[PDB]
């Protein structure tokens, strides 16, 4: 949901320019910076909290209740909040102005028969002058007393001139009171009251709010960030600490290369004209492009190369599956803690920052450490295979040949291409050439 030039709160309260959001539901309410308010000046104590919980519900669904205020005027309005040409006020709110020459102590009640939690948003008015107070509220001493069968809340108006805004030196304090199922709500105000027209159907969902001005293009992407959705194919990311949905861990490192292939010893002896065909040892065969491990025979019939799929496959299998195992393909998170602020709040703020920061450092370590372990481990794995296939041959060839050391076996007997092939599959038998080879060796 794009609240455009509107804050989730200005939408809740019911600001003229944000009325379009009334009865709105959402998964992730995006709050733009271009945002702003244009209604009667207000101040929400512990504002952040209220805003947070609202975003959690994920719906500004309002349900007007039939409140009955006796002996007092209703639907008050002012210029500051003009809905169209004529003045106006908050939508889900109602201004209670004195009736005639008296403001009887208003006292009503509202039960919560419904099985879902109700959220009533009210407020108190802070007169800028005594005459304004005694005029708009009769008795100069106002008082609001919202209370439920569980908690109790009482506020007192604070008369006094304050910073002029939208043409007003007055203010309105916002206060919210949740009413659990079965419980009942009560309001006993002497004046300066700003009774609501109903409540909001609070829900428990993955709904949350994120701050950003990022464009909204049509597309599907599980992860969302203040910088715009990002692919969650990788384990971590360095885009932003604030995330939503299935996103990679936010590590400090902007990059981490994981060894996927084999350790490479580039360059080649490329020995002369006639090719020694020398064993791997200190060189890889950039020529072999049909596998990871292969053989090269130098028989009387000439030269030749063939890759052993068996050995090569074992390596690949181990490599592929590992990554996903170590790191979890994904993990979801929705509403969290504000990982940013615009002003100082002392204690509370400090803690919040520490928590998040501590997380990153600890997490980053795991990533760094993990990658190092993987790469280091992969090399040994692939390098081992190459070493086994070499020993698998030693046991196979038996006496017939000798390990030159250069990574080759100097067979001591005429070996045609078929003779070689029989050794690569492993079928080859030593006795066959035993007598023959034995001679060329010790003679």
């Amino acid at each position, epitope marked *: 949901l794009d609240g455009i030039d509107c804050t989730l709160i200005d939408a809740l309260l019911g600001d003229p320019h944000c009325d379009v959001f009334q009865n709105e539901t959402w998964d992730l309410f995006v709050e733009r*910076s271009k945002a*702003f308010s244009n209604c009667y000046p207000y101040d929400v104590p512990d504002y952040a909290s209220l805003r947070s919980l609202v975003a959690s519900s994920g719906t500004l669904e309002f349900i007007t209740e039939g409140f009955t205020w006796t002996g007092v005027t209703q639907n008050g309005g002012s210029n500051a909040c003009k809905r169209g040409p004529g003045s106006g006020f908050f939508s889900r709110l109602n201004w209670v102005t004195k009736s005639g020459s008296t403001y009887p102590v208003l006292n009503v009640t509202m039960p919560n028969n419904d099985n879902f939690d109700k959220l009533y948003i009210w407020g108190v008015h802070h007169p800028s002058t005594n005459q304004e107070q005694t005029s708009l509220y009769v008795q100069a001493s106002g008082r609001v007393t919202v209370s439920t069968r569980r908690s109790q809340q009482t506020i007192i108006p604070n008369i006094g001139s304050r910073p002029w805004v939208r043409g007003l030196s007055s203010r309105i304090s916002i206060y919210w009171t949740i009413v659990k199922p079965g419980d009942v709500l009560v309001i006993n105000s002497n004046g300066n009251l700003i009774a609501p027209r109903g409540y909001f159907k609070m829900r428990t969902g993955k709904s949350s709010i994120m701050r950003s001005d990022a464009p909204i293009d049509t597309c599907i992407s599980e992860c969302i960030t203040p910088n715009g959705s990002i692919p969650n194919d990788k384990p971590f990311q360095n885009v*932003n600490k604030i995330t939503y949905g299935a996103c990679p861990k936010y590590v400090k490192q902007n990059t981490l290369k994981l060894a996927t292939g084999m350790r490479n010893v580039p360059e080649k002896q490329t020995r002369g004209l006639f090719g020694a065909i020398a064993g791997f040892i200190e060189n890889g065969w950039e020529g072999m492009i049909d596998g990871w491990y292969g053989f090269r025979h130098q028989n009387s019939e000439g030269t030749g190369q063939a890759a052993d799929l068996k050995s090569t496959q074992a390596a690949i299998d181990q490599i592929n599956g590992k990554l996903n195992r170590v790191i979890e393909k994904t993990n979801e998170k929705f509403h969290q803690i504000e990982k940013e602020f615009s002003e100082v709040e002392g204690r509370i703020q400090d803690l919040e920052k520490y928590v998040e920061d501590t997380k990153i450092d600890l997490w980053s370590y795991n990533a760094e450490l993990l990658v190092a372990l993987e790469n280091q481990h992969t090399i040994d794995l692939t390098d081992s295979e190459m070493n086994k296939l070499f020993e698998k041959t030693r046991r196979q060839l038996r006496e017939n040949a000798e390990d030159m050391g250069n990574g080759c076996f100097k067979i001591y007997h005429k070996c045609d291409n078929a003779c070689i092939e029989s050794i690569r599959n492993g079928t080859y038998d030593h006795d066959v050439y035993r007598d023959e080879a034995l001679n060329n060796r010790f003679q």
Partner: antibody, heavy 126, light 111 residues
Framework: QVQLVQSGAEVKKPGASVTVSCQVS????????LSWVRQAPGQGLEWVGW????????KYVKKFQGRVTMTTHTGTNTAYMEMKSLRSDDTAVYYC???????????????????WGQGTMVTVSS | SVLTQPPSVSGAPGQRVTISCTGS?????????VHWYQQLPGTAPKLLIS???NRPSGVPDRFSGSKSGTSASLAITGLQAEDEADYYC???????????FGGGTKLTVLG
């Protein structure tokens, strides 16, 4: 209802320098971006620089980099445009309009220029 | 450089005039939000149409903005006397790490 006050048209010889100032009314410039465009007499328009209040980000034309420079008085709700070692040709009308590219966006692109100023006319000649 | 725009366009009152604006592959494949600004005679420019037909408040709907392939255009219906002014197809590019502007157009209501 957002107004834009622009510094009184100025005139200075080439090699000298001038500075255009922009004021804002209503929406705080702080929650809005900004850029400047030169309007050579009947020559069309040409985007010059771009700044982002509360974001301290700046991007200039490859052509006049260094020569021009942005500034912002977050305290007085006014932006500044500095032009040093001016050039005879460079003289023209200058404007300052709102931009959406703020916060997470950073990039101007997405935002469509809104609410442009009346315009300041500087004149460079020897 | 400057986006490709027509030198001038002109039609009779109450007709449809199209202003063609083509861009470079950098702007093309990116199709970065293209906007148009109506600059009346001797007066600061204004947002005529934004975000690829995103409508500015207060501007008659007779103005529409389309975009496809390597170019986009602005259509004007029921052309009125006032409707004549200088138009520029503003956009943003990447290869130049900046925003591109339109050469210009001079709309004049026949009569």
């Amino acid at each position: 209802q957002v107004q834009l006050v622009q510094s009184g048209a100025e005139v200075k010889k080439p090699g000298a320098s001038v500075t255009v100032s922009c004021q804002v009314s209503g929406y705080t410039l702080t929650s809005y971006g900004l850029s400047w465009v030169r309007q050579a007499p009947g020559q069309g328009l040409e985007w010059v620089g771009w700044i982002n209040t509360y974001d301290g980000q700046t991007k200039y034309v490859k052509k006049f980099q260094g020569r021009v420079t942005m500034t912002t008085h977050t305290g007085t709700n006014t932006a500044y445009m500095e032009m040093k070692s001016l050039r005879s040709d460079d003289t023209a009308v200058y404007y300052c309009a709102r931009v959406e590219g703020v916060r997470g966006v950073m990039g101007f692109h997405y935002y469509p220029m809104d609410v442009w100023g009346q315009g300041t006319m500087v004149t460079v000649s020897s | 450089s400057v986006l490709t725009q027509p030198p001038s366009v002109s039609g009779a009152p109450g007709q449809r005039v199209t202003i063609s604006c083509t861009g470079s592959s950098s702007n093309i494949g990116a199709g970065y939000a293209v906007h148009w600004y109506q600059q009346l005679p001797g007066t600061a420019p204004k947002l005529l149409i934004s975000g690829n037909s995103n409508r500015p408040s207060g501007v008659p709907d007779r103005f529409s903005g389309s975009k496809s392939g390597t170019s986009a255009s602005l259509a004007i219906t029921g052309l009125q006397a006032e409707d004549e002014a200088d138009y520029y197809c503003q956009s943003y590019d990447s290869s130049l790490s900046g925003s591109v502007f339109g050469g210009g157009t001079k709309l004049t209501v026949l009569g």
